[PDB]
C-alpha cells in the first residue's frame, strides 16, 4: 500500500501496475468488405503500390 500525509495523519493512496493487458485490444478485421464499385476498386488499386 501507498501512504501520503494530508492532515498530519497519513492516508492510503491507490496503486496500479502497468501491464500489456491495458487496452491492447487486438482487432484484425476478417470477412472481405467487398464492393461492386469500379471507381473504389480502381482508386484502391492505383494507390495500393504506394505502401
Amino acid at each position: 500500500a501507498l501512504y501520503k500525509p494530508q492532515r498530519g495523519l497519513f492516508h492510503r493512496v491507490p496503486l496500479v501496475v502497468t501491464n500489456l493487458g491495458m487496452s491492447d485490444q487486438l482487432g484484425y478485421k476478417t470477412e472481405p468488405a467487398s464492393c461492386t464499385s469500379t471507381v473504389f476498386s480502381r482508386a484502391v488499386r492505383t494507390h495500393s503500390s504506394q505502401f
Binding site: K29, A33, C35, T36, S37, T38
Partner: protein, 262 residues
C-alpha cells in the same frame, strides 16, 4: 401557432442515411425550409445541413450559436441561389437502440430553441432497434415542439403532424449535403489527431502507435462509408441511365401517337 410540417423525401434520405451512419452514438443536423399558409400554418422543409457533434455523450445534444450562424449563412446562400425564401426552420437527431420519443432533455432543448423563435420544430429518428424474438427490424421518426405544462411548472412535449412529400428526383443541394458525411468524418479524425500532435512533449513510439490507429480508423471509414456511398451512386447512375432510356422511348411513342393527328 404552427399546425403541420411537410418534409421533402429529398432531405428525408439525407437524414435517414446520417442516422444509419452509426449506432454507437447520437448524431444531429439542421433543417432548412419555409413558412406556408392555408385555410393552418405549415413548415415546408426542402433541405438539411449535416453537423458534427462536439459534446457527444448520451442524450446531451445541443447546437452552438456558431452552427446557427453557419445555418443562417447556408439559408441566405440557398435563398439567393434558388430564389426561394429559405430560413433555418428545424433540427433533427438520432436515437439508436433508444425509444423514438423525446427525453426531458430533448424537450428542454426544444424549448431553449423556441425561445429563439416559436416557429422552430424538432425531429427524431429511432435507428437500429433489435428484437431477436420477432427477428424484425424497425426504424421510426417523429416531429415535436414544447409547451408550458398544465400548471406553472416547466416545459412538456407536444406532437406535430409530419408528412413526407414525394420529390421524384434528388436535388443538387441534397447530393452536395450527403457527400459531406465522409468529409466531416475525415475532418473529425484529423482534428482529434491534431489535438494529439499538439502535445509536443510526447514519445515517438506513442506517435507510431497513434499513426497506426489513425490509419486503421480511416481504413474503417472508407470500408464502411465512402465505399458503399460511391457504390450506391454508381448503381443510381445505372438506374438513371435505364430510366432515361425508357422515358425517351415513351416520349418518342407519345410524340408519334399525337403528332400525326394534325
Amino acid at each position: 401557432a404552427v399546425q403541420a410540417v411537410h418534409l421533402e423525401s429529398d432531405a428525408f434520405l439525407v437524414c435517414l442515411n446520417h442516422a444509419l451512419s452509426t449506432e454507437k452514438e447520437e448524431v444531429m443536423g439542421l433543417c432548412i425550409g419555409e413558412l406556408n399558409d392555408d385555410i393552418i400554418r405549415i413548415v415546408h422543409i426542402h433541405s438539411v445541413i449535416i453537423l458534427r457533434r462536439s459534446d457527444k455523450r448520451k442524450d446531451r445534444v445541443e447546437i452552438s450559436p456558431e452552427q446557427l450562424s453557419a445555418a443562417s449563412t447556408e439559408a441566405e446562400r440557398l435563398a439567393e441561389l434558388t430564389g426561394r425564401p429559405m430560413r433555418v426552420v428545424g433540427w433533427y437527431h438520432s436515437h439508436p437502440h433508444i425509444t423514438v420519443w423525446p427525453s426531458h432533455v430533448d424537450v428542454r432543448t426544444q424549448a431553449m430553441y423556441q425561445m429563439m423563435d416559436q416557429g422552430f420544430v424538432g425531429l427524431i429518428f429511432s435507428c437500429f432497434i433489435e428484437d431477436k424474438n420477432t427477428k424484425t427490424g424497425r426504424v421510426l421518426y417523429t416531429c415535436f415542439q414544447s409547451i408550458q405544462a398544465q400548471k406553472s411548472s416547466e416545459y412538456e412535449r407536444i406532437e406535430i403532424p409530419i408528412h413526407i412529400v414525394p420529390h421524384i428526383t434528388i436535388g443538387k443541394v441534397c447530393l452536395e449535403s450527403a457527400v459531406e458525411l465522409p468529409k466531416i468524418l475525415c475532418q473529425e479524425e484529423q482534428d482529434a489527431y491534431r489535438r494529439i500532435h499538439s502535445l509536443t512533449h510526447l514519445d515517438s513510439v506513442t506517435k507510431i502507435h497513434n499513426g497506426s490507429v489513425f490509419t486503421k480508423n480511416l481504413c474503417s471509414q472508407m470500408s464502411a462509408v465512402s465505399g458503399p456511398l460511391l457504390q450506391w451512386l454508381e448503381d443510381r447512375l445505372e438506374q438513371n441511365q435505364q430510366h432515361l432510356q425508357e422515358l425517351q422511348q415513351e416520349k418518342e411513342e407519345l410524340m408519334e401517337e399525337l403528332s400525326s393527328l394534325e
